[PDB]
Structures are given as structure tokens and as C-alpha cells.
Design a binder for this molecule. Structure first.
Ligand SMILES: [Cl-]
Ligand SMILES: [Mg+2]
Ligand SMILES: [Mg+2]
Lengths: 397, 400
């Protein structure tokens, strides 16, 4: 039984306010969770509640969402069993009463949702991934790391160690390649300062050449050892054949949001042509919402979904999106937001669900690195029972 | 009693390997600590042990330091009482047998040192700052925030910092800093400058200019330069090795602190610098003192500097770090608890700085979780303290 719930305002990796919640149980269980925040939010994402007080953080305060936790949510949830995740989440969903969590705030709700799962794992004496996924939680994710950013139209250029035999090796290959890329950029007189996700933004096809060169320089085989993924996020500058040229030219394994978030017909066309060649990920298209994913499955749109906890607002609804995707033969790529925190929940979440892929940033900034560190702790704990799939994560192909 | 000790190789904020250690106790206490790593390491720092296997992380692995913990250190420390910090640290110091901890590695030793203190706090049911400092741990630090850099441009000085000396709480200090940081960001955006960040979360656009830019950002954020937000800077002069020049910057701008303005081995130069400027500015020894009581003692006797930058991994143990802090205080010197440019998700320095009531912290700009995690922990600590908390701001500077 949950005995107390407390929220506070802390800062994310961009120095912007976000919500942190703590849950206490009768047995002495403790869980603390922090909610990340996007900058390129899709228009159909769950409501992130901001104060709009221009005298605090330019109106980016989350004191209201925090008070919604400390008041209404605390009253509604205290007394529930900490292990009753679905009841806890549905209770908050009903309490809000709006489809997009706009009354209480998705950031208020998710903070409690995650802190509850953590408190439950704590009081059971289980690591988070074991509690969330059960005895067969064992698959470590093949990570796509955002090393080059976009001047440039495409938003994220990623390396993905599909040839690694463990997560540890995947992390080392990524780090070595990142630092090779860093040296490469330094030669060409580019800045080695980093964007929000830890990657570089030097001054659409050029980054593909740069990635291949960096991979080769680090002593790895492009395609076999390290492949390329990218997120167009085309909603920000709103063609299929240009994408397909890139795909056939370069060792690309995944492409995300290659078309606008509301262009359902164009997506279906895209998927028909390229669905056999590459992973096609919907991000702004699906917004971690089962109602949107269901539509795409019926239309044969995409073959993958980017899973973002705060796009939907509860751990339960996130489980439901991941499982719906799996049953449709879609991969579920568990994802960070561009505004991250010291919270590492997504690492445990992706192993718990055996999703097989993660998108949690480049090889710099602790807001990304902490996730990779946790994944390594998880792999160590799993020992011989662990599994890293690499290219075999792509059951959608 | 400590029953188990385990170490592993994890990654820092630059994507470089570092040591993480865990300590388990008989009562079921648990502690986990991670060791930071510097880029501009002073030559007299304790030894950071690296593998040198160029087939792994370009030779930056720390598997040896990790194995040193899992083997030798674990055998020497397991069975010791977890609350016996001084004995635990001395046991490791003697076990290594070398003055610079070059045999086992300072990174191996510090990882266990800090994890022990955490495991002790955990089994006692105490927050870390409470365990480390006792019932009068209550002072939140005035933070100096590295928002502009110069350590690839025409600027020789390494860190350009804002410091909310006019805030009434740490929460306010953090907000003032973040608002100013974001004001600064828009300003660089206006001038066609990049908004990408360096290792510590500050901007690196393309010596006087950063001071003028900082003053402008402070003003645009709606704060008063000097009274509300002052300027501090770290030249790190050693990395590129004058008093009247420095005194021009100090007299021209609302500067409250300057760090390593001279070379790490120029004690005579430092002495005359302090003679000139010691009355109107904080003078911080970083590479000069390397968190080492032997170096600080020499500085104190010669009348060199009036402040020391406190870095745990510069000396290798929590105990020796406590000793540097107390020696500094007793000499009328301030102790600025500090991060390294290579940080982790570990937030020990936040609890350490409150535990010792040091009054100042240097833990980075207002971006990157490697910095922000510390500011978050300080806010958690301030909320916990409640009415018993104290933020000193400009009054942290008892050396002036
Ligand atoms: Cl920086
Ligand atoms: Mg996207
Ligand atoms: Mg320094």
C-alpha cells in the first residue's frame, strides 16, 4: 500500500523545469522518477502542463503539475497497492477526465506512474527490469546513437552497432566511432561542441558520407558491424525517391518520420515501396498512442513505432503500445526525449519488454550516457542469461 | 561490517570509461559511487589509472583499476566497519604503498572510498549530507556556473562563470542561473553564434569579450551584475604557460573570483599576485593545490591564494578531501567543491558541499545532466532542510 506521494520541480538536460515524483510504501519501498520533455513535440502528444508564469523560467515552470501530484493525485492514489500499476494508472486517467491528460498534466501523471513502478520494484527487492518484464526479461537493445544533427534538413543521423555481440560491445563500438568522428570533424575545421542529444552539428547527403568514413576509420565495417539510421522528422520542413536513393546508396537500416505527421496516404505509399528494404519508424505519426498505431497497422503504414512514455502519459498505456506493435510485427523503439534527465527508466523498460532496440542519444552527455551505463549494469546482472540480437532485432524485416 | 565490494567499468559525460564501485554491508546497506575524470589534469594530481589497450576505447579503459578493486582492495576492506571511513581510506592508502596512488590507481581507491560512505549513510537511514556532516550540515553553496568557455578561440581564459551572490536560496540561485543561461543563448543566437555546448554545458563562441557578453546576459535576464549575479573565471594558465591585466579585468567587471591565474608551479608569481589582488577578489588555487594538504600548507605559509578548488579525484579519498577542506577553513580560505570536466550521474559533491558547509560549489553550466543532476540534488537537499537551511550568497566569501 502506498503511504505517501511527493513531487517537486527539478531541471532537465536543457536547464528547463520538469516534474519529479516520489512514492513511499508501507513496507518501506521507495521510488523516484523524473519526466523528460520534448522540443519537437508532435501536435497529438499528451498534454505537458506548463505554468506560463513569465517571471519564472520564461513561463516553463511546472509548479502547477507538481501541485496536481501533491494534491489531487496524492489523494486519489495513496492507499492503493503499489504493485497495482494498471489500477494506479487508470485511477489517474479517470481523475483527469480528459483524453489527453490536459487537466492534471501528462507530466504530473507520468511522474507518479513511474515512481510507483520503481517503489514496487524496490519493496519486492527486484531490479526495475525484472519487476517490469518478469523472469524472461533478458534482451538487451540494439541502440541507434544520434551523432550528427540537422543547413541540413534531416534531423538525426545515427549509427547502430548491429554487428556487436553484446550491449557492452555495442557501447564501445559506438564510443570509439563517436570519438573517431570527433577527430574527423576537427581535421575539417568543424566545431566539436554538441547539440541537445550529445551529437555534433557541423555545416542532406554529406552526413551519410561522414558516418561511413568515421565507421571505417574506427576500424569497423559499415553495414555489417555498424549500420546507419536517420530521423527526417519531415513535419518540421513541410520525397520518397530521394530517400530510397539514400537507402540503396548507403548502409541504412532504419528511417524515421520520412513524411509529415498527418500525411497518412503518403506514408502508405512510402511503406509499400520501402517496407521490404528498411525499418520505417513512425514517431510524430503515432505519438505512442494505440489509437494512432492501430490506424497505421490497418493501413499498412510503417513497420515500427518510436515509444515515448511522456507522449502518452502512463506506463500502462506505454506497455499497451509496445505490445500492440509487437503483435502487428512492428518493432517498438523505446526512446528518450531531447530534454532528458538523470532518470534511466527507459533502459529497464526496453529490457523488460524485450523490444530489441533503443534510441537514447549519442556517446556524450550524462543525460544519454546514464542510460547506456544502466543497460551495461543490466547486462552484467543478466550474465549468461542475457541476449544481444544486433541485426536480428529487426523481426519486422 | 562491509560484506561485499564490486566494481565495473562505465562511461563518463564525454563517453570515456571510468570506475564505478558498489559496497554492501551486513545490515543490508548499499552504496554506489562513480569516479569523474579531468581533461585539464594538473601534473600533481593523484594517478588516474588507465589500461592503455588501444583496441578498447583508444586505450582509455579502466579494467585494471576495476580489477584492483575487485581483488586487492576488496580483500583488504571487506570485514571493516562501513562507518569507519578514515580506517577504510588509510587501509587503501597503505595497501597501494605509493604517495600518488599509482599502483592501484586513485580512481580505483576513490570509487570504494565514496561507495563506502554512501553504504554507511544508507544503512543508518541518513541522507548522504547528513551522514557526512552531522546535525549542523545545512549551508547550501553559492554556485559558480560555467556558461562560456575558452579552453578554440582568441580567448586564453578557460572558464567564464556567473555566480548568483544575490539569491536568497539555492532554488532561486538555480533559477537565476538558468534564466540567465537561456538569455545568454538567445544573445549568441542573435549574433549568429552557435548554441552547441562544450564539456561542461557552456557555450563556446568565437579575453575581455566574454565579460561584456556575460554582463549583457545578466542585465537582459533582469538581474544586477555584481549585486545579484557576479562573475568568476578560471584561466587555467598552466594549459597555456599578467597581474596588472587581471587587475584590469577585475576592476572593470563585477568579478568576485579568479582561479589559477598563474602557472601551477609558479609559487613566487602566485605570492605577488595575492599581494596585489587578495583584498578585493577571491583567488582560487586548483592545479596549484591539487586538493592536497601538503600543497595547501605551503600556500598558506607563503600567503598564496585565499581559496582552494576541492576535487575528490585529485587526491583519491574522501578522508584526505575532508582534511583539505578543514585545513582551508582553519586558514581563512574558502573551499570550492568542484566537478571535473568529465562527469557522471553521481551527485556526491552536492552532499559533500552541504555536509562541510563549504559555501561554494563549481559544478557546471545550466545544461547537460552531468551538471544539472548536481543542481537537482542540491534542490532536494534544500527542500529536505526546510526552514533549517541557509543560503549565504555573497556572505559565503569569508576570505574577503
Ligand atoms: Cl562548457
Ligand atoms: Mg523523431
Ligand atoms: Mg580549474
Amino acid at each position: 500500500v502506498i503511504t505517501d506521494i511527493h513531487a517537486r520541480e527539478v531541471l532537465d538536460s536543457r536547464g528547463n523545469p520538469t516534474a519529479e515524483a516520489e512514492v513511499y510504501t508501507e513496507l518501506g519501498g521507495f521510488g523516484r522518477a523524473i519526466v523528460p520533455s520534448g522540443a519537437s513535440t508532435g501536435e497529438h502528444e499528451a498534454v505537458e502542463l506548463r505554468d506560463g508564469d513569465k517571471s519564472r523560467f520564461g513561463g516553463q515552470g511546472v509548479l502547477t503539475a507538481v501541485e496536481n501530484v501533491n494534491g489531487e493525485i496524492a489523494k486519489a492514489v495513496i492507499g492503493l497497492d503499489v504493485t497495482d500499476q494498471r489500477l494506479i494508472d487508470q485511477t489517474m486517467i479517470d481523475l483527469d477526465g480528459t483524453p489527453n491528460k490536459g487537466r492534471l498534466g501528462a507530466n504530473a501523471i507520468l511522474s507518479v506512474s513511474l515512481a510507483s513502478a520503481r517503489a514496487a520494484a524496490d519493496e519486492l527487492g527486484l531490479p526495475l527490469y525484472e519487476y517490469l518484464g518478469g523472469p524472461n526479461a533478458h534482451v538487451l537493445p540494439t541502440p541507434m546513437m544520434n551523432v550528427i544533427n540537422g543547413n541540413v534538413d534531416i534531423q538525426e543521423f545515427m549509427i547502430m552497432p548491429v554487428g556487436a555481440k553484446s550491449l557492452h560491445e555495442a557501447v564501445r563500438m559506438g564510443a570509439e566511432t563517436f570519438h573517431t568522428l570527433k577527430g574527423l570533424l576537427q581535421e575539417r575545421g568543424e566545431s566539436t561542441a554538441v547539440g541537445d542529444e550529445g551529437g555534433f552539428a557541423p555545416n542532406n547527403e554529406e552526413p551519410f558520407e561522414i558516418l561511413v568514413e568515421a565507421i571505417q576509420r574506427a576500424g569497423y565495417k559499415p553495414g555489417q558491424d555498424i549500420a546507419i539510421a536517420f530521423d527526417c522528422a519531415a513535419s518540421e520542413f513541410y520525397w520518397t525517391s530521394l530517400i530510397e536513393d539514400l537507402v540503396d546508396k548507403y548502409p541504412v537500416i532504419s528511417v524515421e518520420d520520412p513524411l509529415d505527421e498527418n500525411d497518412w496516404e503518403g506514408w502508405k505509399t512510402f511503406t509499400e515501396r520501402l517496407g521490404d528494404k528498411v525499418q520505417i519508424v513512425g514517431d510524430d505519426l503515432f505519438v505512442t498512442n494505440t489509437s494512432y498505431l492501430e490506424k497505421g497497422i490497418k493501413m499498412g503504414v510503417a513497420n515500427s513505432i518510436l515509444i515515448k512514455l511522456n507522449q502518452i502519459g502512463t506506463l500502462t498505456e506505454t506497455f499497451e503500445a509496445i505490445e500492440m506493435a509487437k503483435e502487428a510485427g512492428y518493432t517498438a523503439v523505446v526512446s528518450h526525449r531531447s530534454g532528458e534527465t538523470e532518470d534511466t527508466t527507459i533502459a529497464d523498460l526496453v529490457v523488460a519488454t524485450n523490444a530489441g532496440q533503443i534510441k537514447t542519444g549519442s556517446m556524450s552527455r550524462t543525460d544519454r550516457i546514464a542510460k547506456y551505463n544502466q543497460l551495461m549494469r543490466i547486462e552484467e546482472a543478466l550474465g549468461s542469461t542475457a541476449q544481444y540480437k544486433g541485426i536480428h532485432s529487426f523481426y519486422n524485416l
